[PDB]
Amino acid sequence: ACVFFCEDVGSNKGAIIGLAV
Amino acid sequence: ACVFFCEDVGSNKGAIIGLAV
Amino acid sequence: ACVFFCEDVGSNKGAIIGLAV
Amino acid sequence: ACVFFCEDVGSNKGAIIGLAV
Amino acid sequence: ACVFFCEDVGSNKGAIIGLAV
Amino acid sequence: ACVFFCEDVGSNKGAIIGLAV
Amino acid sequence: ACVFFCEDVGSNKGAIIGLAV
Amino acid sequence: ACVFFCEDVGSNKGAIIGLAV
Amino acid sequence: ACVFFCEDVGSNKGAIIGLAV
Amino acid sequence: ACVFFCEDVGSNKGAIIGLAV
Amino acid sequence: ACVFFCEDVGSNKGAIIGLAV
Amino acid sequence: ACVFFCEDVGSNKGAIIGLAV
């Protein structure tokens, strides 16, 4: 899998986290 | 806006994320 | 302290975050 | 949205920047 | 000086670049 | 192209690498 | 090729960018 | 798990890769 | 706190370092 | 020595790793 | 060995650098 | 100019810093 660096929609500040896809 | 790499306050968690400002 | 990159235990969508250790 | 680290197309410049998607 | 990672307003794609301040 | 961070399929020790996509 | 981080000659606001060398 | 950035001893160039631990 | 990248005042060889702000 | 972030030549793999020089 | 991104102790300086371990 | 990420020889720990060249 790969890590996407995306805003967390489950965060009221749209913090950019790593998403493991 | 800017993206800064910061520890998210308010917790013990120690998470460092991209904050959009 | 150092910046670690770890899976966020508890997160429900396989998140990877910086961590201040 | 996500931020990817990509070479900006269309040029010779070779610039790599954060693209917001 | 420091490098801020910010959207370029002189870019029609808001590409995130390093700004030297 | 963009820099992706993905697991290295085939690698025997769970390696994560940049990938030029 | 390698990712270099260099000042963008020509840019009018002291920009620093990745560069594919 | 976390990603350690370490030389690969299974590489004759000691390339630094992400190790998933 | 956030990771800034700044010139190291005092350093005699134009060093750029992370800075915990 | 320096660490550069480069695509490892010789292959199709597209791996980008830290090279020590 | 590994490279970690850590604040260098012993000072007020707040410098974050790559430590080789 | 560009930033090289190199061990500081004026450091007894060979810490990797950004060198402005």
Author numbering:
A (entry chain C), B (entry chain A), C (entry chain B), D (entry chain A), E (entry chain C), F (entry chain B), ...: 1 to 21
Task: Quote the authors verbatim.
In Alzheimer’s disease, the Aβ peptide self-assembles to form oligomers and fibrils. Using this approach, we have discovered that β-hairpin peptides that mimic Aβ17–36 β-hairpins assemble to form triangular trimers that further assemble to form higher-order oligomers, such as hexamers and dodecamers.
We designed 2AT-L as a covalently stabilized analogue of a triangular trimer formed by 2AM-L. The design of 2AT-L is based on the previously reported X-ray crystallographic structures of triangular trimers composed of β-hairpin peptides derived from Aβ17–36.88−90 At the three corners of these triangular trimers, Leu17 of one monomer subunit is near Ala21 of an adjacent monomer subunit. The Aβ17–23 and Aβ30–36 β-strands of the three β-hairpins that comprise 2AT-L consist mainly of residues from the hydrophobic central and C-terminal regions of Aβ, creating two hydrophobic surfaces on 2AT-L. The three hydrophilic Aβ24–29 loops extend off the hydrophobic core of 2AT-L. In the crystal lattice, four copies of 2AT-L assemble to form a ball-shaped dodecamer. The dodecamer is stabilized by an edge-to-edge hydrogen-bonding network between the backbones of adjacent trimers and by hydrophobic packing at the core of the dodecamer between the surfaces of the trimers that contain Val18, Phe20, and Ile31. The outer surface of the dodecamer displays the hydrophobic amino acids on the other surface of the trimer—Phe19, Ile32, Leu34, and Val36, as well as the disulfide bond between Cys17 and Cys21.
